[PDB]
RNA sequence: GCACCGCGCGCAGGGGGGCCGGCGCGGCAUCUGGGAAGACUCCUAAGGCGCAAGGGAAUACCCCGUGCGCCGGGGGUUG
């Protein structure tokens, strides 16, 4: 409750990193007598490899691992809830090939890959759920997937243009994140932030918010403010014009880090609702929301 | 259903079907289920094309047993109408068979997409 | 500890290391019959005739490693003692098919797998008229 | 002239200008596919000279994985006469055939195939041959003939499925004995078409090497496949 | 550039294609009055935009991309209505749009004509597209596959009763077609009609001329009388 | 055309029926250990003409009946491309005399 | 690390290697470390990096 | 083994290292060259191409104006 105390360090080894974290929550179990059991949490993570990790933090060290013939996996997430106790994790990657792991009964297994790009050269780079079977990925092609999870389709190919600020025509959308009516917010290679249409899959808005290229996005729970965190250093702020719906405008910016905001994540209850960015310069700044 | 190696990215159909429409002009395809199979059973035939639009789908079904037997590879576009004009027919084109030769850049192509091919199976 | 082991031929209990009981059966059409209702998990005439003890439920076990036959078999009222489903049960239900040597003497002292091989032929023709030609 | 090879149940045919590999035909007078056959028999009928004994029906490498892995020089196959071995994809009846020979009349192989052509052709190859029994389930679900199969010898595994490794884990953790073999032949274009076929075939023995067998040996099949490897191994020991 | 544009029927707005291919065109959206950007309407294609068309009353707009995808957008709610493909096209060239009595949620023109680079011209009804929903694959009301080389010009007439479409790769080569009935004229353009290669087309405010131009530099009149 | 389809289908099942015999006449394998000593100790074990005529007679049949095909295929491209320069309507493939290629780019209507 | 595998010619034997990465992390692919990089600086320099030093 | 009043040299090879310099394989945001290339673009010109004969030669290569065809330019009023 705004105390922000550190309690555990697990270390990895030495030429190991830590790309990407996500937790799995079970929902609220209830017993015979009306008691609650809570969602028992898993942490998983990769560290620029083909390995899907799971740590275990009763034990402060790394509890499996699991891998399927792939290539280096970049970006990864949890389906979210509509099933119950199967739950599965979405895994994008270098060469293409969307990978699927399994998670149930305390297991983390390679189940299957859904599908591979034709281009060889298409590398997934961020990943996000707009419902339980729908997956949206961005890619390095300048382009933002949507397939669809049960039977591996696509629905559709979102395109992004070319950047005429410099060189390297190819635009890198490096967040995708899924508002709570159905829109997708994309931060990619331009700084600028796109407002994507959920029923058609088009885009709305495109909003020039940075100098430097979008990073990372977060997106309020009741989906009312947008943060997204650059690589000028800057994060900026986003609430819906009044009026008009699906139009979103900068409200401010402000440079809070002092190198780039890699990360963010945000957190909504007990009378809290903060996001926390971390960035390069190793200090987790903590904005209220 | 039974068109297992479907090439559902429209990115992949346009490679495709652009493929398609070069060596329609190379003359180095044959278009048809019948020429199809001769091509395929001669075994002249680099890789092979049939459409999933077909009303009955069951008249195209032999062709992925004598591509198993002969280890060529086949895939499945959406539209039959899409392929017919795509070799330049004016008619509709359930399967389409394009052939190699010696040195090519077509056949440098023909090479890619097949490997492209072998992604999505 | 009940442990229930289905062959193609009959059924094996180890309850007290060393084997307790046994149910054999030869040579019939109502084979393929038992085969399905093993596939699904229903009621079976040599399920219940071992399953059906007099006294009571004495301790509430019976070792089946596949979940969908075990709370298939959990279902119905016939004797009420609710099973136990795979819990990575490897070195029960593989050491007594490796093993399964030393049972032959018991219950029936012969080589029963011509039955198993028509079963097995029997149930591929069933399959291949249910993919018709 | 015909000699045993150094694998029981396995012979070669000699030559001036060829060496061939054969097996020794459980149905004498029968072709199953359309194969070349050697008839020789034992010595000591010179003023008859007419070959009646032994009927050789000659392995094509070609179209089997198998044979293509014993002219590449495979040290063991793991399986003699009279033992018990377990063929992952059967299509058709094609090699399950020699492996039936080369196990005999004591030995027994069971055959499972998913596809239902295949399947067709492989009961009705079956129906002469009657140490192998067919079993046409996907092999990705073992408890469906968990009643069919009792415990084998060998595994002999040619399915191209990407989760072979998978396949051959369940069906040898129900029905492998301690200290088996496993004959695996991978397909590289199949498991991975655009990576090095070396780091999918080290992917593949490591997968294995985790799923608690122990590989002895692995060998490409090129001069008669394209990307193919042959992974001979042992479980437990 | 801004070579290719389209002024609205109501002439407040004028679109222009912006010239960023990438796998998907857009076209920034003009207020006329002003010569402002009002708004921007981005499609996905593979080589970007082949035309578009402004909707009867004005609002929305049509653009028809390269690779089939056809896209309706609308200028009220600024986003797109919705994506259907055209059939069998292996890519698009032209698109007009006209006729009158309409889908009212769709602008009110009644008929669509997309000409791919094969030499086959679609006409749609437009009141099949909508199963606000658009069917992903309507069926034409009629294929017209007269030219066999790239349709590069394609005009209704402004009651809604004529649709001159044309390929300029050949010479003579235009075709007249009647509407609803969708039924190819037979007797204009004859062996010695002199067309040359057509260039551009127009018909008349009260659709009684049309004048065609070709890559000579000639334009030429004929009354349309019915 | 017909006469040199029938002539290659001959001449490719003879190339194939070669190939199958000349293989059949004549870090490939890979043996894995647990350690450095069961390596070694393998090494200690490791330690402890009429092929050549007719080798080369089935290669250079094999080359001789791939040249034969090579011939075959490359006449019944030919004839295709004579095809397509002497079908009733423009059709496109092969080259002119000058060099330039035959494209046109009108559909079969 | 693992020991280098030796050929006698035509085959090769060669130690298995896992005992790299016990319960900890494995280890991170430096090749596509250095990818993730190169799509971040695409034409971009650095600035200059301290103070007034050689 | 050579020098038993010496370093060192000729040679077998066991392991690891500087991972210094090349080679091979793989990815590589861009950049450079080539091919293909959009059909508004180029398509060599008001003419050209093909097939089959005929005639001549630097005799491997080619050139020229008879019979069938395929386009193109120009001209061109609901045939």
Redesign the interface.
């Known amino acids: 409750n705004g105390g922000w105390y550190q309690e555990v360090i697990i270390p ?2 030495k ?3 830590v790309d990407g974290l996500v937790w799995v929550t079970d929902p609220d179990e209830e017993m015979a007598d009306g008691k609650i059991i809570h969602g028992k949490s898993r942490l998983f993570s990769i ?5 899907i ?1 799971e740590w275990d933090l009763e034990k402060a ?2 509890k499996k ?1 699991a ?1 399927g013939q792939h ?2 996996i ?1 970006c990864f997430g949890v389906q979210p809830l509509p099933a119950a106790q199967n739950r599965k994790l979405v895994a994008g990657t ?1 060469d293409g090939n969307l990978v699927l792991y399994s998670i149930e009964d305390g297991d983390l297994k390679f189940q299957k890959t859904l599908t591979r790009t034709p281009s060889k050269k298409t ?1 997934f ?1 961020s990943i996000a759920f707009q419902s339980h079977n729908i997956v949206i990925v961005g890619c ?1 092609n300048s382009t933002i997937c949507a397939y669809d999870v049960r039977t591996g389709t696509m629905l559709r190919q979102m395109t992004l243009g070319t950047d005429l600020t ?3 025509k190819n635009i ?1 959308v490096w967040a995708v994140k899924c508002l709570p009516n159905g829109d997708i917010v994309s931060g990619d290679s331009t700084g600028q932030v796109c407002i994507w249409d959920g029923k058609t899959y088009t885009q709305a808005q495109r909003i020039q918010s940075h100098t430097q ?1 979008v990073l990372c996005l977060s997106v309020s729970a009741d989906g009312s403010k947008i943060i997204s965190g650059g ?1 000028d250093r800057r994060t900026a702020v986003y609430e819906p014009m009044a009026g008009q719906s699906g139009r979103w405008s900068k409200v401010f910016h402000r440079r809070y880090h002092q190198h780039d905001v890699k990360a963010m994540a945000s957190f909504e209850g007990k009378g809290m609702s903060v996001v926390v960015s971390g960035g390069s310069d190793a200090s987790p700044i903590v904005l209220p929301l | 259903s039974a068109a297992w190696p479907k090439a559902e990215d429209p990115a992949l159909v346009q490679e495709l079907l652009d493929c398609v429409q070069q060596a329609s002009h190379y003359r180095q395809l044959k278009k048809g289920a019948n020429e199809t199979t001769k091509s395929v059973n001669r075994g002249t035939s680099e890789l092979v094309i049939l459409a999933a639009d077909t009303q009955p789908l069951s008249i195209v079904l032999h062709i992925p047993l004598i591509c198993e037997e002969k280890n060529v590879p086949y895939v499945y576009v959406p539209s039959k109408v899409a392929l017919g004009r795509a070799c330049g027919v004016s008619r509709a084109v359930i399967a389409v068979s394009l052939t190699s030769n010696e040195a090519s850049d077509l056949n440098s192509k023909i090479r890619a997409l097949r490997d492209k091919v072998e992604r999505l199976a | 500890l009940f442990i229930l082991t289905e062959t193609s031929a009959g059924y094996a209990l180890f309850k007290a290391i060393k084997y307790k009981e046994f149910a054999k059966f030869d040579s019939a059409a109502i084979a393929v019959e038992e085969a399905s209702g093993i596939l699904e998990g229903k009621v079976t005439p040599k399920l219940a005739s071992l399953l059906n003890e007099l006294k009571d439920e004495k301790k509430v076990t019976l070792a089946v490693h596949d979940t969908k036959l075990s709370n298939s078999i959990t279902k119905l009222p016939g004797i009420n003692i609710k099973p136990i489903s795979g819990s990575m049960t490897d070195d029960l239900f593989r050491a007594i098919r490796q093993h399964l040597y030393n049972l032959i003497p018991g219950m029936e002292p012969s080589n029963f797998d011509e039955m198993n091989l028509g079963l097995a032929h029997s149930l591929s023709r069933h399959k291949l008229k249910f993919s018709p030609e | 002239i015909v000699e045993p090879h150094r694998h029981k149940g396995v012979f070669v045919a000699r030559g001036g200008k060829e060496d061939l590999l054969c097996t020794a035909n459980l149905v004498p007078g029968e072709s199953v596919y359309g194969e070349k056959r050697i008839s020789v028999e034992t010595p000591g009928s010179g003023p008859d000279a007419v070959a009646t004994k032994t009927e050789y029906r000659i392995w094509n490498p070609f179209r089997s994985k198998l044979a293509a892995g014993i002219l590449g ?1 495979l040290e063991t196959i793991y399986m003699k006469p009279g033992s018990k071995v377990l063929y992952l994809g059967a299509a058709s009846g094609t090699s399950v055939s020699h492996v039936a020979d080369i196990v005999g009349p004591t030995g027994a192989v069971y055959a499972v195939e998913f596809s239902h052509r295949s399947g067709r052709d492989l009961i009705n190859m079956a129906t002469r041959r009657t140490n192998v029994i067919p079993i046409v389930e996907d092999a990705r679900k073992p408890m469906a003939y968990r009643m069919l199969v009792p415990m084998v010898d060998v595994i002999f595994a040619d399915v191209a499925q990407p989760d072979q490794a998978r396949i051959v884990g369940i069906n040898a953790r129900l029905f492998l004995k301690q200290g088996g073999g496993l004959l695996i032949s991978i397909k590289a274009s199949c498991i991975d078409s655009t990576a090095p076929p070396e780091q999918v075939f080290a992917s593949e023995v ?1 997968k294995l ?2 799923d608690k067998f122990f ?1 002895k040996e692995q060998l490409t099949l090129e001069p008669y496949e394209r990307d193919h490897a042959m992974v001979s191994c042992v479980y437990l020991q | 550039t801004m070579e290719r544009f389209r002024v609205s029927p109501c002439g407040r707005y004028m679109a222009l294609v912006a010239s960023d291919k990438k796998g998907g065109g857009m076209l920034n959206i003009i207020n006329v009055g002003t010569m402002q950007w009002i708004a921007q309407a981005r499609i996905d294609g593979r080589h970007g935009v082949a035309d578009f068309a402004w909707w009867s009353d004005g609002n929305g707009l049509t653009i028809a991309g390269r690779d089939g995808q056809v896209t309706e957008w609308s200028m009220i709610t600024r986003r797109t209505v919705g994506i259907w493909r055209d059939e069998g096209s292996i890519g698009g060239t032209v698109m007009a749009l006209g006729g009158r009595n309409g889908p009212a949620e769709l602008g009110g023109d009644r008929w669509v004509a997309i000409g791919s680079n094969s030499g086959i011209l679609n006409v749609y009804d437009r009141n099949d597209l909508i199963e606000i929903r658009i069917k992903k694959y309507p069926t034409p009301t009629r294929v017209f596959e007269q030219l066999t080389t790239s349709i590069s010009v394609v005009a209704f007439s402004p009651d809604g009763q004529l649709l001159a479409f044309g390929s300029q790769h050949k010479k003579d080569a235009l075709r007249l077609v009647h509407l609803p009935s969708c039924t190819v004229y037979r007797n204009w353009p004859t062996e010695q009609t002199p067309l040359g290669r057509v260039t551009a087309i127009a018909f008349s405010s009260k659709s009684d001329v049309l004048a065609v131009g070709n890559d000579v530099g000639r334009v030429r009149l004929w009354e349309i009388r019915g | 055309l017909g006469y040199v389809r029938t002539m290659r289908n001959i001449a490719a099942k003879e190339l194939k029926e070669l190939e199958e015999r000349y293989v059949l006449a004549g ?10 000593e069961e ?1 070694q100790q ?2 200690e074990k ?1 330690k402890a003409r009429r092929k050549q005529l007719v080798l080369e007679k089935l290669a250079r049949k094999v080359k001789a009946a791939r040249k034969k095909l090579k011939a075959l295929a490359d006449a019944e491209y030919e004839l295709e491309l004579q095809q397509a320069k002497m079908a009733k309507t423009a059709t496109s493939g092969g080259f002119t005399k000058s060099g330039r290629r035959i494209k046109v780019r009108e559909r079969k209507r | 690390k693992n ?1 280098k595998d ?3 010619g ?7 290697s ?1 005992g790299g ?1 016990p ?8 090749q ?2 250095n ?2 990089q190169a ?2 600086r ?3 320099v650095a600035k200059p990096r301290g103070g007034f030093f050689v």
């Not at chain 6, 870090?27 to 450095?36: L, M, Q, S």
């Not at chain 7, 035509?10 to 298995?16: I, K, L």
């Open positions: 990895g080894g030429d190991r990193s560290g620029y490899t083909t390995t990790t060290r790394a691992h891998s290539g280096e970049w270098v590398k780079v390095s410099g060189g390297s890198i290229d690589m | 020089g490591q090497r985790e590989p | 870090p490939k394998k890979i043996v894995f250990f647990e350690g450095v390596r393998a090494l490791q | 020991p030796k050929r006698v035509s085959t090769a034997y060669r130690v298995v896992n990465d319960r900890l992390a494995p280890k991170a692919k430096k596509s470390l990818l993730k799509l971040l695409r034409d971009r």
